[PDB]
Write an enzyme that holds these catalytic residues in place. Structure first.
Site, PDB file in Angstrom:
ATOM      1  N   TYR A  38      -5.272  -0.872  -0.267  1.00  0.00           N
ATOM      2  CA  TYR A  38      -4.563   0.191   0.440  1.00  0.00           C
ATOM      3  C   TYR A  38      -5.240   0.410   1.797  1.00  0.00           C
ATOM      4  O   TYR A  38      -6.457   0.270   1.926  1.00  0.00           O
ATOM      5  CB  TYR A  38      -4.595   1.497  -0.359  1.00  0.00           C
ATOM      6  N   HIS A  40      -1.077  -0.581   2.366  1.00  0.00           N
ATOM      7  CA  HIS A  40      -0.309  -1.817   2.435  1.00  0.00           C
ATOM      8  C   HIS A  40       1.179  -1.521   2.561  1.00  0.00           C
ATOM      9  O   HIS A  40       1.610  -0.381   2.382  1.00  0.00           O
ATOM     10  CB  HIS A  40      -0.621  -2.781   1.271  1.00  0.00           C
ATOM     11  N   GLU A  58       2.039   2.493   2.428  1.00  0.00           N
ATOM     12  CA  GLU A  58       1.708   3.489   1.424  1.00  0.00           C
ATOM     13  C   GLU A  58       0.209   3.648   1.298  1.00  0.00           C
ATOM     14  O   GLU A  58      -0.545   2.682   1.426  1.00  0.00           O
ATOM     15  CB  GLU A  58       2.339   3.173   0.074  1.00  0.00           C
ATOM     16  N   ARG A  77       1.593   9.037  -3.495  1.00  0.00           N
ATOM     17  CA  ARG A  77       1.391   8.299  -2.246  1.00  0.00           C
ATOM     18  C   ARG A  77       2.024   8.979  -1.041  1.00  0.00           C
ATOM     19  O   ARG A  77       3.028   9.682  -1.162  1.00  0.00           O
ATOM     20  CB  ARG A  77       2.052   6.912  -2.321  1.00  0.00           C
ATOM     21  N   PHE A 100       9.353   4.606  -7.865  1.00  0.00           N
ATOM     22  CA  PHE A 100       8.940   5.864  -7.256  1.00  0.00           C
ATOM     23  C   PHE A 100      10.126   6.811  -7.135  1.00  0.00           C
ATOM     24  O   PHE A 100      11.286   6.390  -7.168  1.00  0.00           O
ATOM     25  CB  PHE A 100       8.425   5.646  -5.827  1.00  0.00           C
TER      26      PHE A 100
HETATM   27  N1  LIG Z   1       8.166   0.566  -6.476  1.00  0.00           N
HETATM   28  C1  LIG Z   1       7.807  -0.038  -5.341  1.00  0.00           C
HETATM   29  N2  LIG Z   1       6.638  -0.704  -5.271  1.00  0.00           N
HETATM   30  C2  LIG Z   1       6.421  -1.257  -4.052  1.00  0.00           C
HETATM   31  C3  LIG Z   1       7.242  -1.200  -2.951  1.00  0.00           C
HETATM   32  N3  LIG Z   1       6.679  -1.885  -1.876  1.00  0.00           N
HETATM   33  C4  LIG Z   1       5.554  -2.329  -2.359  1.00  0.00           C
HETATM   34  N4  LIG Z   1       5.320  -1.994  -3.674  1.00  0.00           N
HETATM   35  C5  LIG Z   1       4.127  -2.361  -4.504  1.00  0.00           C
HETATM   36  O1  LIG Z   1       4.461  -2.884  -5.808  1.00  0.00           O
HETATM   37  C6  LIG Z   1       3.674  -2.192  -6.815  1.00  0.00           C
HETATM   38  C7  LIG Z   1       4.556  -1.132  -7.522  1.00  0.00           C
HETATM   39  O2  LIG Z   1       3.801  -0.142  -8.226  1.00  0.00           O
HETATM   40  C8  LIG Z   1       2.538  -1.538  -6.028  1.00  0.00           C
HETATM   41  O3  LIG Z   1       1.530  -2.512  -5.657  1.00  0.00           O
HETATM   42  P1  LIG Z   1      -0.012  -2.348  -6.082  1.00  0.00           P
HETATM   43  O4  LIG Z   1       0.032  -2.420  -7.559  1.00  0.00           O
HETATM   44  O5  LIG Z   1      -0.667  -3.494  -5.436  1.00  0.00           O
HETATM   45  O6  LIG Z   1      -0.415  -1.041  -5.528  1.00  0.00           O
HETATM   46  C9  LIG Z   1       3.329  -1.110  -4.812  1.00  0.00           C
HETATM   47  O7  LIG Z   1       2.436  -0.807  -3.755  1.00  0.00           O
HETATM   48  C10 LIG Z   1       8.476  -0.496  -3.040  1.00  0.00           C
HETATM   49  O8  LIG Z   1       9.284  -0.369  -2.131  1.00  0.00           O
HETATM   50  N5  LIG Z   1       8.695   0.068  -4.286  1.00  0.00           N
END
Ligand SMILES: Nc1nc2c(ncn2[C@@H]2O[C@H](CO)[C@@H](OP(=O)(O)O)[C@H]2O)c(=O)[nH]1
Ligand SMILES: [Ca+2]
Length: 104
Positions: A38, A40, A58, A77, A100
């Site tokens: 993060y 990202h 985020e 977030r 989300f």
């Molecule tokens: N639900 C969701 N997850 C996203 C999106 N863009 C990126 N992600 C990433 O996909 C995973 C969903 O929880 C997270 O990664 P991370 O597990 O690396 O933090 C999240 O940051 C989006 O638009 N929606």
């Protein structure tokens, strides 16, 4: 009263600004924290009607009031853009799987 309510977590505008500032700084320096790196890109697969332009990033906001520095990011977030404009505050709380929903 809460400016943003993510499930049971209550955040004020100052809570959001503080978290946002830290995330944006890391973004500018091209650095990340935590195993999930993060801040990202947030792709907005959910399709939220954000008032500001993409790309979006985020960054975790913690109910403890501390700035995220690694470890579990929790369910909340703050989403900001390239110009450090707040797009919104979202949460995994009340959303299925890894989806989300917006904090009210
Ligand atoms: N639900 C969701 N997850 C996203 C999106 N863009 C990126 N992600 C990433 O996909 C995973 C969903 O929880 C997270 O990664 P991370 O597990 O690396 O933090 C999240 O940051 C989006 O638009 N929606
Ligand atoms: Ca607070």
């Amino acid at each position: 009263a809460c400016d943003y309510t993510c499930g049971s977590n209550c955040y004020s505008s100052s809570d959001v600004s503080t978290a946002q500032a830290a995330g944006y700084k890391l973004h500018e320096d091209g650095e990340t924290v935590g195993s999930n790196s993060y801040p990202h890109k947030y792709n907005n697969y959910e399709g939220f009607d954000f008032s500001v332009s993409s790309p979006y990033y985020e960054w975790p906001i913690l109910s403890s009031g501390d700035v995220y520095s690694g470890g579990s990011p929790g369910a909340d977030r703050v989403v900001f853009n390239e110009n450090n404009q707040l797009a919104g505050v979202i949460t995994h709380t009340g959303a299925s799987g890894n989806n989300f929903v917006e904090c009210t």
